[PDB]
Design a binder for these strands. Structure first.
Ligand code: DUP
Ligand code: CA
Ligand code: CA
Ligand code: CA
Ligand code: CA
Ligand code: CA
Ligand code: CA
Ligand code: CA
Length: 903
DNA sequence: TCAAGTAAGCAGTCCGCG
DNA sequence: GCGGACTGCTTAC
């Protein structure tokens, strides 16, 4: 096999690399890597190295990395550019792996671990590590085993060994229900004392040294705690054995309102799953506890136990260990679904960076672009300092708040990356500037043509057309990968809908799910077999189709995130290729394109309808337009359609055969007007929306910018078995909105869009009557809580104190003096409830850590004083009033003359 | 919330608005 | 009581 790196580090003048050799063996080596950097040289001096602008450079080979770093300093002292890759390990990787890396995940040791620490005096601070580690479960991907290290004797209690037989039993048998499929994969090791436990763990670590280290909150808790605990018991040298190169560093992570410490283990790539999840999942959760996320992702019930966690080991050590093992498995289950580790490896090896650098788009793109240029013997420029400056972004049309019955939307393919490609926007393709007219003049095609020679953006920038810039070139490669995976995602999505349809008529029989690749549209043969399958088999296929779709979603959406991140990076001062001229060339072209096509679509449709100045485009945001199709439907006549699907087909055909060609013509003209290098503005139909044929549903409504709801029948070629609500921006979509309220508001919207005003009124009246029965957690608001200290005037709300912060201060007084009560963590999220006047908490609201039950110390009192009236009005009635006034409907039946008596 | 970008919504505080 | 200036938080893209 071809070799590939596992990890790389710079330690002084040595590169330390762990890698898989040509025989598939893990190896380590120390290399005295001599780096090269570059300086501009005279035209005379013959060279093969040129900077991205075509100016000649001399290569400087240094005796060692320290010399190179020092030279960079002196070059700054002199005031001259020091060119080349200043991150020496990236240059090392580029030299050592000068080919497209193909990696084998089966050779990469991926470790997933979790520890337990009993603490009777509150949260056990990793930086202190004053409490024994009493459990470690460590899963190894190469062995496919869970290694369980269990402390039987501690100052906080001596316990009996964990029993695998009881662990396997159902909760109803008194067991812990450790999943049967991992029972045989557990290697259990009890220990007489903590020193023994930790010494054995370190020996185990040495034999099975993680390459990728993951788990839940491992970077902020598990790793620093293990490191600091071993340091406290044995000393520094022993704790550094967690690093294969025996090198560690405390890293201070700074944010706006403080800082925290983590331990960097040289020679290990830490990918904390909570951070992977936050970056790659595209969710915003009310809580990020493993329990909450597992339930959300996997639909597994929370891990139940009696009493506080600080008494769990002593009271039920059996459950204690089982839950430690289950916690490790949950992360594995989430990754089996989401595949973020696979994604991270793909991206890391593609860019040739330390795997953990995938968290940084800037680092990722710096490496991709460096490797690309190096292949042509080109030399990258030095990074410079820039002051942070605001710059303009996308255009969003102000909609007329209203109901909108029939709607067709259209969307540009991967807009920002397409603009970069079309215009040829790159650091080295800048050709000059032209005199800009007001954006309106370009939108209306009355401005003078910018250039007869170069490719232009309406921000005034011109670009070369003779060759592609490196940014367009590299962005295209990733865009093409993204396209492939999106293809698989949509096929799986369409396949899912085929199965749902079949599920309307499941056969009475015993059979098996078909063995198929869900990434490709089902053939006619497969469809026929599906129509004969049992519900059991069909549901299994649906689950599998949906898992395939999730895998495709992960692969496609995060590759899109990467290329969009490059457009954004051009506007970040730490990016080597930072340039507001290029960042704004993109955004400004975007504004023109959206409004240009709005005009063209309006023009086209007015022509087809034979009307004048009518506004068909009702809304647009960045790269999408929403078109009223009422007149198109009315041209045929609603009474002439057989069913809902009939007009959906009709609108689909009209969009594809009439509107898209017109849109294409419009954008080709714009391309020529801007003299762009390549036409890549591809705007296809996205959604077809409307009420069910013959219903009183309103189809859709807008309340304002970034706030709307549509009843969609077809999305990007997926014809739904059942209509799907597309709701953007509304309270149903916000993590701050109480869970039960999201649900209720969503049902109100469904009724508005699908059934009509009377159905809406029926549901509202019922929710209003019954909501007081809802679990307090389901009706609590949620909010991140920052700057708590700023607003704490020992210990009451200071001036301008935010509502949720006030709740926290209320909570803090109510639990003061209590060492064991759960503390609100700065920067985390809290549940928030309003309190009725005269309550014993002495304030109008209380807040506690999200994803948790409020402590029994005050639960009863909170429940008794909860202000249901305020809650309802603020979280439900206000938003609903917004929806209904926009849609021009009433959520409460207004009086009429008919109310004048039945008999 | 360490880690690419801007636009823009709504809750809430403070306080004017005769 | 509503709206502006402002902070805080959260989405859409
Ligand atoms: O996180 C984002 C999302 C979007 N954008 C910009 C770039 C993107 O091209 C544009 C439109 O975003 P979409 O959600 O429409 N996705 P995009 O058009 O990039 O690809 P596609 O529409 O094909 O999914 O908005 C960002 O800069 N950052
Ligand atoms: Ca735990
Ligand atoms: Ca790849
Ligand atoms: Ca798009
Ligand atoms: Ca998309
Ligand atoms: Ca059937
Ligand atoms: Ca869009
Ligand atoms: Ca207001």
């Amino acid at each position: 096999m071809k070799e590939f790196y596992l990890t790389v580090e710079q330690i002084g003048d040595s590169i330390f690399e762990r890698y898989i050799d040509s025989n598939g063996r893990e190896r380590t080596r120390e290399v005295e890597y001599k780096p090269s950097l570059f300086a501009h040289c005279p035209e005379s001096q013959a060279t093969k190295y040129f900077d991205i602008y075509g100016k000649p450079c001399t290569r400087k080979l240094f005796a060692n990395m320290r010399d190179a770093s020092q030279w960079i300093k002196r070059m700054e002292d002199i005031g001259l550019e020091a060119l080349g890759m200043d991150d020496f390990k990236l240059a090392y990787l580029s030299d050592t792996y000068n080919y497209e890396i193909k990696y084998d995940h089966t050779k990469i040791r991926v470790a997933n671990f979790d520890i337990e620490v009993t603490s009777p005096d509150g949260f056990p601070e990793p930086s202190q590590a004053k409490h024994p580690i009493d459990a470690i479960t460590h899963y190894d991907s190469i062995d496919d085993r869970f290694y369980v290290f269990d402390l039987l004797n501690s100052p906080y209690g001596n316990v009996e060994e964990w029993s695998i037989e009881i662990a396997a039993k159902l909760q109803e048998q008194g067991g812990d229900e450790v999943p049967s499929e991992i029972i045989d994969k557990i290697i259990y090791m009890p220990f007489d004392n903590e020193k023994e436990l930790l010494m054995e763990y370190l020996n185990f670590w040495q034999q099975k040294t993680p390459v990728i280290l993951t788990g839940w909150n491992v970077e902020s808790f598990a790793i620093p705690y293990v490191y600091n605990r071993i340091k406290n018991i044995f000393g520094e040298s022993t704790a550094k054995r967690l690093s294969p190169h025996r090198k560690t560093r405390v890293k201070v992570i700074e944010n706006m309102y403080g800082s925290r410490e983590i331990i960097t283990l040289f020679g290990i790539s830490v990918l904390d799953y909570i951070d992977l999840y936050k970056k790659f999942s595209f969710t915003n959760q009310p809580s990020y506890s493993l329990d909450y996320i597992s339930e959300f992702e996997l639909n597994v019930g929370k891990l139940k136990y009696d009493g506080p966690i600080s008494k769990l080991r002593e009271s039920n050590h059996q459950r204690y260990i089982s839950y430690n093992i289950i916690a490790v498995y949950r992360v594995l289950q989430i990754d089996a679904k989401r595949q973020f580790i696979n994604l991270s490896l793909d991206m890391g090896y593609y860019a040739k960076i330390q795997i953990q650098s995938v968290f940084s788009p800037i680092k990722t793109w710096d490496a991709i672009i460096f490797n690309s240029l190096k292949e042509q013997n080109k030399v990258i420029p030095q990074g410079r300092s820039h002051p942070v400056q605001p710059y303009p972004g996308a255009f969003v049309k102000e909609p007329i708040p209203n109901r909108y019955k029939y709607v067709m939307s259209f969307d540009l393919t991967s807009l920002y990356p397409s603009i970069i490609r079309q215009v040829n926007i790159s650091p080295e393709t800048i050709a000059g500037t032209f005199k800009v007219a007001p954006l309106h003049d370009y939108i209306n095609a009355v401005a003078e043509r910018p250039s007869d020679v170069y490719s232009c953006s309406p921000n005034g920038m011109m670009y070369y057309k003779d060759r592609d810039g490196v940014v367009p070139t590299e962005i295209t490669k990733v865009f093409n990968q993204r396209k492939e995976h999106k293809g698989y995602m949509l096929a799986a999505q369409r396949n899912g809908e085929i199965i749902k349809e079949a599920l309307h008529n499941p056969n009475l029989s015993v059979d098996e799910p078909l063995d198929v690749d869900y990434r490709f549209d089902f053939s006619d043969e497969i469809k026929e077999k599906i129509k004969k399958l049992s519900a059991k088999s069909l549901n299994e296929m649906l689950f599998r189709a949906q898992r395939t779709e999730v895998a495709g979603m992960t692969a496609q959406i995060n590759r899109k995130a990467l290329i969009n991140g490059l457009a954004g990076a051009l506007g970040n001062v730490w990016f080597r290729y930072y340039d507001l001229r290029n960042a704004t060339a993109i955004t400004t072209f975007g504004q023109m394109a959206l409004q240009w096509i709005e005009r063209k679509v309006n023009e086209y449709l007015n022509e087809v309808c034979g009307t004048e100045g009518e506004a068909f485009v009702l809304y647009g945001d960045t790269d999408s337009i929403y078109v009223s199709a009422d007149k198109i439907i009315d041209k045929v006549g609603e009474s002439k359609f057989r069913d809902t699907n009939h007009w959906v087909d009709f609108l689909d055909k009209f969009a594809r055969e009439r509107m898209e060609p017109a849109i294409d013509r419009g954008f080709r003209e714009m391309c020529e007007y801007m003299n762009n290098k390549q036409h890549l503005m591809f705007m296809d139909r996205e959604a077809i929306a409307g009420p069910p044929l013959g219903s009183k549903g309103i189809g859709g409504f807008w309340t304002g910018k970034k706030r709307y709801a549509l009843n969609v029948w077809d999305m990007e070629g997926t014809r739904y078995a059942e209509p799907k609500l597309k709701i953007m921006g509304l309270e149903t979509q916000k993590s701050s909105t109480p869970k039960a309220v999201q649900k209720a508001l969503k049902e109100c919207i469904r009724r508005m869009l699908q059934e009509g005003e009377e159905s809406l009124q029926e549901y509202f009246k019922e929710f209003e009557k019954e909501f007081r029965q809802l679990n307090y957690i389901s009706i609590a608001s949620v909010s991140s809580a920052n700057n708590i200290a700023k607003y704490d005037v020992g210990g009451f709300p200071g001036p301008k104190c935010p509502f949720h912060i006030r709740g926290i201060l209320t909570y803090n007084r109510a639990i003061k003096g209590n060492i064991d009560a759960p503390q609100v963590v700065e920067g985390e999220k809290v549940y928030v409830l309003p309190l009725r006047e005269g309550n014993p908490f002495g304030d109008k609201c209380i807040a506690w850590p999200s994803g948790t039950e409020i402590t029994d110390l005050i639960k009863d009192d909170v429940l008794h004083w909860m202000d249901y009236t305020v809650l309802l009005e603020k979280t439900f009635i206000k938003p609903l009033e917004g929806f209904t006034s926009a849609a021009k409907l009433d959520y409460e039946k207004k009086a009429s003359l008919f109310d004048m008596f039945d008999f």
